[PDB]
């Protein structure tokens, strides 16, 4: 479903006084959006290996909804939801936020019947299907769709068609000691009512102390308490939820993550670098990260028969290290 292309955004969503600003602040460290580097082990490896002038990873765009009803205006203006949540208290809360979003959808589906009711034509067929489904359920819970259906769906970008990742905000203590009444029940719920949904705990407090403390004391802190920042796992969760991923260009001058959508084929992949490449492109030279690491160098990868040469019909895969060729 969703918008076309790679210019997506994920939105920070939940009730007030639940850590939104903190959560936003920590990511940062436009005042309502920020781009955050995605952390990646591969990237680091490639970068250490080539020691390039220029290092450029992928980024997540995250929106700290400032502006409900106007609130939902901005949600429709995002491509998925970071459902933030505090730790009855968080389950009532989850049911609420789901309630609003489902109700904003029916409320918009109304006129979409009205205006369509004069059959001048095949679209009318499918909107019923949707309404029928959204007078039960969220759009996304229907894992069966088609080209005709997605077209129409994408016309209105319903709130319940956006994907969702649950973030449970916690006291320093519960994250660290790794047990919390609510996370159990939330996970119970998510399994019952949103199967597959990611639930990721974290502590805004904790994360913010870590911003303040010196990389030295910082490390002493994370050593002492046998714990980790939760952020990297959340940034990746967001990116993954947007259906984004990337490929690499590594060489002595630059290593770079190039964000793409699942299914992007090599010519559109190359067009990210320069738009003449979508047409101008005869093949892509691909090395999987695994092989480059194992074999230990490009000539080793080549010598071992693993430096594959894909044509114009190749779906780039996440992690591919690619030299694109033209003319
Ligand atoms: N796990 C936790 N530990 C300590 N303090 C916490 C906490 N979760 C939230 N808080 C506190 O709540 C206060 C307000 O948090 P924050 O501004 O991030 O929430 P919010 O953005 O939902 C308020 P608003 O609704 O005005 O945007 C902060 O000063 C923060 O210390």
From Swiss-Prot:
ATP binds at residues 17-22, 170. A motif (Nuclear export signal) lies at residues 206-213. Expressed in all tissues tested but its expression is more abundant in testis, liver, lung, and brain. Overexpressed in several malignancies, including cancers of the colon, rectum, ovary, lung, stomach, and uterus. GO terms for molecular function: ATP binding; ATP hydrolysis activity; cadherin binding; GTP binding; metal ion binding; ribosomal large subunit binding. The keyword Metal-binding applies. GO terms for cellular component: centrosome; cytoplasm; cytosol; extracellular exosome; extracellular region; membrane; nucleolus; platelet alpha granule lumen. Pfam families: MMR_HSR1, YchF-GTPase_C. Keywords: Acetylation, ATP-binding, Cytoplasm, Hydrolase, Magnesium, Metal-binding, Nucleotide-binding, Nucleus. The keyword Acetylation applies. Residues 8-222 form the OBG-type G domain. It is found in: Cytoplasm; Nucleus; Nucleus, Nucleolus. Residues 243-326 form the TGS domain. GO terms for biological process: ATP metabolic process. Induction: Strongly down-regulated by DNA damage-inducing agents. It comes from the Eukaryota. Mg(2+) binds at residue 21. NCBIfam families: redox-regulated ATPase YchF (TIGR00092). Belongs to the TRAFAC class OBG-HflX-like GTPase superfamily. OBG GTPase family. YchF/OLA1 subfamily. Monomer. This is Obg-like ATPase 1. It comes from Homo sapiens (Human). The lineage of its organism: Eukaryota, Metazoa, Chordata, Craniata, Vertebrata.
């Amino acid at each position: 479903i969703g918008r076309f292309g790679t210019s997506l955004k994920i939105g920070i969503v939940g009730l007030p006084n639940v850590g939104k600003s903190t959560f936003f602040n920590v990511l940062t460290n436009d005042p309502n959006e920020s781009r955050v580097p995605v952390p990646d082990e591969r990237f680091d490896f490639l970068c250490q290996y080539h020691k390039p002038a220029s290092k450029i990873p992928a980024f997540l765009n995250v929106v700290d909804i400032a502006g409900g009803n106007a609130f939902l205006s901005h949600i429709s203006a995002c491509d998925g939801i970071f459902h933030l949540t505090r730790a009855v208290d968080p389950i009532r809360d989850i049911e609420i936020i789901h309630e609003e979003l489902q109700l904003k959808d029916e409320e918009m589906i109304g006129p979409i019947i009205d205006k369509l009711e004069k059959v001048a034509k095949p679209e009318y067929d499918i909107m019923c299907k949707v309404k029928s489904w959204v007078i039960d359920k969220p759009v996304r819970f229907y894992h069966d769709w088609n080209d005709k259906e997605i077209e129409v769906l994408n016309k209105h970008l319903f709130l319940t068609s956006k994907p969702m990742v649950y973030l449970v905000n916690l006291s320093e203590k519960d994250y660290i000691r790794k047990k919390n009444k609510w996370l159990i029940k939330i996970k119970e719920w998510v399994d019952k009512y949103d199967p597959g949904a990611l639930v990721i705990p974290f502590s805004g407090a904790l994360e913010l102390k870590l911003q303040e403390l010196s990389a030295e004391e910082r490390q002493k802190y994370l050593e002492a308490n046998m714990t980790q920042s939760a952020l990297p796992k959340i940034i990746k969760a967001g990116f993954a939820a947007l259906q984004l991923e990337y490929f690499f260009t590594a060489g002595p001058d630059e290593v770079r993550a190039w964000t793409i959508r699942k299914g992007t084929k090599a010519p559109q992949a190359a067009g990210k670098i320069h738009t003449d490449f979508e047409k101008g492109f005869i093949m892509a030279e691909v090395m999987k990260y695994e092989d480059f690491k194992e074999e230990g160098s490009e000539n080793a990868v080549k010598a071992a028969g693993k430096y594959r040469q894909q044509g114009r019909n190749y779906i780039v895969e996440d992690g591919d290290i690619i030299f694109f060729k033209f003319n």
